[PDB]
């Protein structure tokens, strides 16, 4: 229960610190932060899969963080990006589109 609350918690903080979430593992949700002038490139804020994605979606809806179905991008960030790192160069244009 203690661990459940911290996980919750952590998930909401992660969602709220994001500019957008891209979604589709079977299911994927990845958070992206881009704040022009602060972040030179977008950064990955979180990565959730499978059962956790439904809760991410609910939290994003509550918080007004947009969540976009972008299946190739979600897959590429899942395999090729890392949380708390800037996005890979190969995904800059795809990511720019979800930030427009």
Swiss-Prot record:
It comes from the Bacteria. It is found in: Cell membrane. Signal peptide: none annotated. Component of the yop secretion machinery. Belongs to the type III secretion exporter family. This is Yop proteins translocation protein U. The chain holds residues 240 to 339 of 354 of the full protein.
């Amino acid at each position: 229960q203690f661990h459940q609350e911290i996980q919750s918690r952590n998930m909401r903080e992660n969602v709220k610190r994001s500019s957008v979430v891209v979604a589709n593992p079977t299911h994927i949700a990845i958070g992206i932060l881009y704040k022009r002038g602060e972040t030179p490139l977008p950064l990955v804020t979180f990565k959730y899969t499978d059962a956790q994605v439904q809760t991410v979606r609910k939290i994003a809806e509550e918080e007004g963080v947009p969540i976009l179905q972008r299946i190739p991008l979600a897959r590429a960030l899942y395999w090729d990006a890392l949380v708390d790192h800037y996005i890979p160069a190969e995904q800059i244009e795809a990511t720019a589109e979800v930030l427009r």
